[PDB]
Structures are given as structure tokens and as C-alpha cells.
Design a protein around this ligand. Structure first.
Ligand code: AMP
Ligand code: MG
Ligand code: MG
Length: 328
């Protein structure tokens, strides 16, 4: 058994993959080469903040004719629209008109204009994203953005999608033990080694920490762990903090009763979308939504440092920072 890792700056963040394998090292190296090539290629497909991505091209055709996309992107959009509908739009993959207004706020610390923001909100109806795919052999997959000026932003689901694609790639290379970490979006594949095989111990950060040390760790196998939070990306102006997760009803950063939500799911795509929806919805409505998805678990960290975890994971949680308390 040998342990490997590799990390690079790609898709706007640090992406790291750790593998344990008994295969020849040259086979592991080849798999990791392909992981990082995939991440480069997919940055060019999915990115909402590059002018030259496939998504940018799709957005440039809003209000016009349907656009041919590859089956991968079509599938991701289908899943995004599914979580949009299930979450009552709390997760909304067509929020680009609003996100881009706040985004420039980040760069130069300024809050969007009232009427400008109001206008942007009229161009975020995800029910106007029409996906069509014929049923005959080799029929193309198309996307049409019906509403003029609407803009897709898949920031709340793309890391999950890519983590799932990487797991599929690792498995294709006959690997079965890995920790995939895309800017904190984790997939724990199989079991690690201590030969003693053990669950991966996935850390969850103090929402207000310097990010160094985890506050809690959860032991998992074959599971994604994806966290959304109110302090991973924000700017401040005149004593007010404006974070990156938007409430689509208000067009402002969500005012919510949790500091972070972590979703545990067999598919990272699903964990990523649900984490964002749940953050926007807040605790009680999240619990209601999650009743719909029995195969997922959740861990909520509240502003008062209480932690609540669903029945499927609560016994797997260990508190490392004693300021936090796990309710049982
Ligand atoms: N309510 C929302 N639904 C979907 N995407 C959002 C929403 N608010 C912001 N976004 C975009 O998705 C990112 C949040 O994803 P996450 O960190 O996974 O919660 C933001 O940085 C925006 O790019
Ligand atoms: Mg998300
Ligand atoms: Mg995310």
C-alpha cells in the first residue's frame, strides 16, 4: 500500500486528491494526471466568471435559439433545475443577473443599487430554462434560456458535480480509496488505511475560524460532505457584512438562523445543491425539505455554537473544539 496526493490551483480554488492504492504507482500517477486535466477542461465548460467558457456562451444566447450542449452539462442542468423546483427556488441556478451585481460589490466594496437589483430579480426565473433532448439515436441535447437577460451561475453545484466526476474517473482507474477535496467540497471514497481500514475523518470548520483547524470531525465512507456558510465569502461596508449566498426572494445575502449547513450524500452534486438551499431556507424549513431526501444526512452549526445532526450521522460526529456542543 502506498499513499499519494496531488494538489493544484484550478476552478478558482485549491483542489487536492489523496489516494491509497496497491496498484503500480504509474497507474495512480496516470489517474491523477487525468483528474487534474479534467478539472482544467471543466473550468472551461462551467465557469461563470470567465468570458470564454461554454456557460458564458450559453448565457450570451439568452432570449434566442436553443443551444447544443454536451450530455454532461445537460445532465448537470437537469439536476440543478430539479433542486430548484424541490427547494421552491431557494437554490436557483439562474441567479446570475443578481450574483454579478453583488460580485462587483465584492471587488469594489459597494452594495448594489435598489432599482438595479430589483430589475435583476426579474431575470432569474429558472422555470424559463428549457432543456430538450430528442429520443432518437444520437439526438442532440439543447438548452434554451427563454427570458431575455437571464444568466446561469452554477457556483452552488459545480464543485459537487466535479467531485462526482472525479470519483467516477478514479473508479474507472480501479481505485477505491480516495479523499477528493475541491475547495472544501469533499468526497470520501471508500476507506482509508491506518492492513487496518478505517473511515475517513472529515473535518467541518468553525464558521468564524481562521479555517486552519476543524471544529468537528465526522467519520464517513463512500459519502460526500459539502458545507455552505455565511463566512466563506463576503465583504463588509459600513459595519455590515454581505455574504455570497443570495436569498432569491430578497435579492440580498440570505438572513438565516444557521451559520453553516453540511450535507452528507452519496452524490456530491446533490450535497452541494442541498447545502445552498438549506442555508437559504434556514433550519426548520431545511428539515422539512430534507424529509424528501431520506438518503441524505445533515449537520447544522448555529450561531450559539450548538450543533444538530441527523440520525444517520450524529453518532459519527466528534467535537474537537469544546466551545461547540453536539445536541443528541
Ligand atoms: N441561492 C442561490 N442558489 C444558487 N446559487 C447561488 C445562490 N446564491 C449564490 N449562488 C451562487 O452559488 C454560490 C454559492 O454556492 P455554495 O458555496 O455552494 O453555497 C455563490 O457564490 C454564487 O455563485
Ligand atoms: Mg452548494
Ligand atoms: Mg458549494
Amino acid at each position: 500500500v502506498r499513499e499519494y496526493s496531488r494538489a493544484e490551483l484550478v476552478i478558482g480554488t485549491l483542489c487536492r486528491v489523496r489516494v491509497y492504492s496497491k496498484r503500480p504507482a504509474a497507474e495512480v500517477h496516470a489517474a491523477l494526471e487525468e483528474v487534474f486535466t479534467l478539472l482544467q477542461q471543466q473550468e472551461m465548460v462551467l465557469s461563470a466568471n470567465r468570458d470564454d467558457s461554454a456557460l458564458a456562451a450559453l448565457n450570451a444566447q439568452a432570449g434566442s435559439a436553443p443551444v447544443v450542449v454536451d450530455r454532461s452539462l445537460y445532465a448537470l442542468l437537469e439536476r440543478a433545475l430539479f433542486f430548484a423546483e424541490k427547494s421552491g427556488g431557494a437554490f436557483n441556478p439562474a441567479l446570475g443577473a443578481v450574483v454579478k451585481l453583488w460580485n462587483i460589490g465584492f471587488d469594489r466594496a459597494a452594495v448594489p443599487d435598489p432599482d438595479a437589483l430589483k430589475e435583476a430579480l426579474t431575470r432569474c426565473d429558472f422555470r424559463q430554462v428549457h432543456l430538450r433532448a430528442g429520443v432518437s439515436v444520437g439526438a442532440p441535447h439543447t438548452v434554451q434560456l427563454a427570458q431575455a437577460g437571464m444568466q446561469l451561475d452554477l457556483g452552488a453545484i459545480a464543485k459537487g458535480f466535479l467531485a462526482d466526476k472525479i470519483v467516477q474517473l478514479l473508479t474507472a482507474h480501479a481505485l477505491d480509496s480516495a479523499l477528493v477535496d475541491l475547495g472544501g467540497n469533499i468526497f470520501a471514497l471508500g476507506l482509508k488505511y491506518g492492513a487496518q481500514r478505517l473511515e475517513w475523518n472529515v473535518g467541518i470548520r468553525d464558521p468564524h475560524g481562521t479555517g486552519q483547524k476543524p471544529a468537528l470531525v465526522v467519520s464517513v465512507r463512500d459519502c460526500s460532505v459539502v458545507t455552505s456558510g455565511a463566512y466563506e465569502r463576503f465583504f463588509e461596508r459600513d459595519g455590515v457584512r454581505y455574504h455570497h449566498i443570495i436569498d432569491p426572494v430578497t435579492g440580498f445575502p440570505a438572513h438565516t438562523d444557521v451559520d453553516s449547513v453540511s450535507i452528507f450524500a452519496p452524490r456530491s452534486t446533490d450535497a452541494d445543491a442541498l447545502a445552498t438551499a438549506c442555508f437559504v431556507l434556514g433550519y426548520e424549513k431545511s428539515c422539512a425539505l430534507l424529509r424528501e431526501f431520506p438518503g441524505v444526512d445533515a449537520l447544522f452549526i448555529f450561531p450559539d455554537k450548538r450543533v444538530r445532526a441527523s440520525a444517520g450521522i450524529v453518532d459519527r460526529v466528534r467535537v474537537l473544539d469544546a466551545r461547540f456542543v453536539l445536541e443528541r
